[PDB]
Design a protein around this ligand. Structure first.
Ligand SMILES: OC[C@H]1O[C@H](O[C@H]2[C@H](O)[C@@H](O)[C@@H](O[C@H]3[C@H](O)[C@@H](O)[C@@H](O[C@H]4[C@H](O)[C@@H](O)[C@@H](O[C@H]5[C@H](O)[C@@H](O)[C@@H](O[C@H]6[C@H](O)[C@@H](O)[C@@H](O)O[C@@H]6CO)O[C@@H]5CO)O[C@@H]4CO)O[C@@H]3CO)O[C@@H]2CO)[C@H](O)[C@@H](O)[C@@H]1O
Ligand SMILES: OC[C@H]1O[C@H](O[C@H]2[C@H](O)[C@@H](O)[C@@H](O[C@H]3[C@H](O)[C@@H](O)[C@@H](O[C@H]4[C@H](O)[C@@H](O)[C@@H](O[C@H]5[C@H](O)[C@@H](O)[C@@H](O[C@H]6[C@H](O)[C@@H](O)[C@@H](O)O[C@@H]6CO)O[C@@H]5CO)O[C@@H]4CO)O[C@@H]3CO)O[C@@H]2CO)[C@H](O)[C@@H](O)[C@@H]1O
Length: 608
């Protein structure tokens, strides 16, 4: 007696299809220990369970239910044994395939599925009870590729850390830099290291590059024990086009549309069982591996036909994503669900009830493009481009925006963040401190790809670890300490982390200083006040006036050009007070010395 798929599978409403489909340990009706197998292949005329158990011969015939789910049992197989399905397709094709619901796969280039128990010891119930979407908490995400952060000494695909070893090396770095979460590039199994995980073959198969399912579970458990969250990158728009993975699965276009980019195939959201596959693949990370959220790649290529709103909204994709976010929130309401959509056509982070797509956060792609465009601009041209930086706050409250400098910006000849900036080595270093000052003191949660905190010069290559040797240079060593201090201020100051999405918590102080290239604003989270001021010109400003409506003290919290961070400023004054007189409506002046390319943060204490 084989378990039946829940009817919700055929409704596109199943989030636990992996409890039935795939390979599972069980006893047959005669009490014999073995493994049951189930695969959805409704157009297939025959399917065999194949593996080492009969030396990769004819294998075990599966029985087809009128549901199109094939089932079979093999007695006595051990955890770790290899298997595949031989699928006799509607079109007369015969293809040996990885289990699409495999929980483990041999190391690429092998695709054989491995028998795996998915019963993991977690001791993170405390972490799970405390868990939050972080609307009014620090959310400071370290985006990481698991194969190219750090390699094992004296070895780099022989020199990969196991998930357990990676957790041991990574967690202290995250804690030291006040990162709250690691966002992993997709760990679903994939054949090509250089896809970075974005060309997926094994949606349920945590990649064997870095070890076994229990090793990844141990990674997540370790993060949770130390107060670190884990966000999984997820690829629901398209799958790798490999002929023996998901394409033409039953000898018909089953997972893909019955008729565009890369070596990938687009998922058919009008196929209910495909919606259940993707629901279940997202849920796997939350359920089996206790992940704290999902970042969904390339959502604009799902939302719009050919990724172009002018070609029309894909209403099937919109309903799929609304239903996916609904089901993830029903099961894991304190999970964090994110995407991006540079078209700004649909309301990505509005509740589905108000015709939104129901994501928690949206990457602010406009902020990233406009900010980097600005700091790439020659100093002489910045007065004309002044409002390139103020523009972000005109649309900021339209979505729940997350300020992201991701892996996509530091590859393919685009240059690393520091290498994008205009000027001399010294000017690039000074502006990099001010750029991240701006990122951490602009409202919205934060994401940074590994290497941003080192001031990396070399573009990301997944074949190489980060240039850890950069820390032998004062600039890079002091920079990663400065990055940690931004994290500490962000994590500890309610002005910065509380009420980020409340327009009453942000106020411009200097937003017309075009000639000077000076910007100043208040962050006013939780009734506390922090003044943020940055000079983006290559000349200092003496006693730059900032106009206040009330008299106040200002105590320096951060100086981006301090000796501490290899900066050029030696100023000693950290305590300022307003003078009486200013401009119409703002009768008080706080006068601040601004080093060339430098930023300062002040705690504001109003007079009573
Ligand atoms: O002060 C505390 C400090 O003490 C120690 O640092 C000392 C350090 O050990 C010692 O060597 C010296 O540092 C000197 C250095 O020796 C000089 O050569 C000079 O370095 C500058 C260099 O000449 C410039 O070319 C420039 O280097 C850039 C490159 O231009 C970039 O392309 C990039 O190259 C790296 C590349 O991206 C990577 O892929 C990889 O191939 O490695 C390349 C570099 O090896 O980055 C570098 C670095 O930004 O700028 C250099 C200045 O930063 O000047 C150095 C400083 O005087 O003296 C140090 C002070 O005593 C200790 O090791 C530190 O941890 C500690 O913080
Ligand atoms: O209380 C009621 C009151 O409210 C409003 O005014 C207030 C305003 O909302 C508030 O932001 C603040 O204003 C500050 C401002 O935020 C500061 O940044 C600062 O602005 C002065 C700036 O530092 C100076 O450089 C100077 O700006 C220059 C530019 O630097 C030049 O590039 C040039 O730009 C022109 C450009 O060349 C042209 O191509 C074209 O683009 O147009 C530009 C002209 O704007 O010239 C300008 C102007 O010389 O002067 C800036 C001030 O104008 O200081 C501000 C305070 O003075 O406080 C305001 C007062 O409460 C509302 O507008 C008022 O009517 C109302 O009374």
């Amino acid at each position: 007696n084989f378990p039946t798929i829940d009817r919700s599978f055929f409704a596109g409403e199943c989030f636990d299809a992996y409890r039935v489909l795939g390979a599972h340990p069980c006893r047959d009706d005669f009490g014999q220990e073995g493994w049951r197998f189930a695969v959805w292949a409704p157009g297939a005329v025959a399917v065999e369970i194949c593996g080492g158990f009969d030396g990769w011969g004819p294998g075990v015939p599966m029985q087809k239910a009128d549901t199109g789910v094939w089932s079979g049992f093999v007695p006595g197989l051990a955890e770790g044994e290899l298997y595949k399905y031989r699928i006799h397709g509607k079109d007369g094709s015969t293809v040996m395939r990885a289990d699409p619901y495999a929980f483990s796969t041999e190391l690429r280039p092998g695709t054989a599925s491995r028998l795996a128990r998915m019963d993991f010891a977690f001791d993170d119930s405390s972490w799970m009870e405390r868990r939050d979407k972080c609307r009014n908490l620090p959310l400071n995400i370290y985006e990481l590729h698991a194969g190219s952060w750090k390699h094992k000494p004296n070895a780099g695909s022989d020199g990969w850390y196991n998930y357990r070893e990676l957790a041991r090396e990574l967690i202290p770095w995250l804690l030291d830099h006040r990162f709250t979460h690691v966002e992993l590039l997709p760990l679903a199994e994939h054949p090509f290291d250089g896809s970075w995980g974005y060309q997926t073959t094994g949606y349920f198969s945590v990649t064997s590059r870095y070890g076994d399912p229990a090793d990844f579970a141990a990674f997540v458990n370790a993060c949770h024990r130390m107060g670190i969250g884990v966000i999984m990158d997820f690829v629901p728009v398209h799958f790798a086009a490999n002929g023996d993975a998901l394409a033409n699965f039953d000898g018909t276009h089953l997972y893909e549309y019955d008729s565009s980019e890369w070596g990938t195939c687009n998922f058919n959201y009008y196929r209910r069982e495909v919606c259940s596959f993707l629901n279940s693949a997202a849920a796997l990370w939350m359920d089996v591996y206790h992940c704290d959220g999902i970042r969904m790649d390339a959502i604009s290529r799902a939302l719009y036909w050919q990724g172009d709103p002018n070609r029309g909204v894909n209403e099937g994709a919109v309903t799929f994503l609304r239903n996916l976010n609904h089901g993830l929130n029903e099961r894991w309401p304190t999970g964090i669900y994110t995407a991006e959509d540079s078209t700004n056509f649909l309301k990505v982070t509005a509740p589905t009830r108000y015709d939104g797509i129901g994501f928690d956060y949206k990457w602010d792609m406009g902020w990233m493009h406009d900010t980097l465009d600005y700091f790439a601009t020659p100093f002489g041209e910045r007065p004309d481009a002044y409002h390139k930086l103020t523009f972000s706050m005109q649309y900021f409250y339209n979505e729940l925006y997350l300020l992201a400098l991701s892996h996509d910006e530091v590859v393919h000849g685009k240059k690393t963040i520091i290498d994008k900036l205009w000027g001399t080595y010294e000017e690039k270093c000074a502006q990099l401190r001010t750029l991240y000052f701006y990122m951490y003191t602009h409202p919205g949660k934060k994401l940074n790809f590994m290497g941003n905190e080192l001031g990396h010069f070399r573009e990301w290559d997944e074949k190489k670890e980060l240039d850890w040797g950069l820390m032998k240079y004062p600039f890079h060593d002091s920079f990663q300490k400065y990055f940690a201090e931004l994290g500490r201020l962000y994590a500890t100051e309610p002005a910065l982390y509380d009420g980020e999405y409340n327009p009453n918590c942000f106020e411009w102080i200097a937003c017309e200083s075009r000639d000077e290239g000076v910007y100043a604003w208040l962050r006013k989270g939780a009734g506390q006040t922090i003044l943020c001021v940055m000079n983006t010109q290559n000349t200092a400003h003496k006693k730059f006036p900032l106009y206040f409506q009330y008299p106040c003290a200002a105590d320096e919290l951060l100086n981006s050009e301090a000796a501490c961070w290899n900066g050029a400023d030696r100023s000693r004054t950290r305590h300022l007070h307003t003078t009486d007189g200013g401009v119409y409506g703002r009768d008080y002046t706080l006068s601040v010395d601004l080093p060339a390319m430098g930023s300062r943060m002040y705690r504001i204490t109003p007079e009573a």
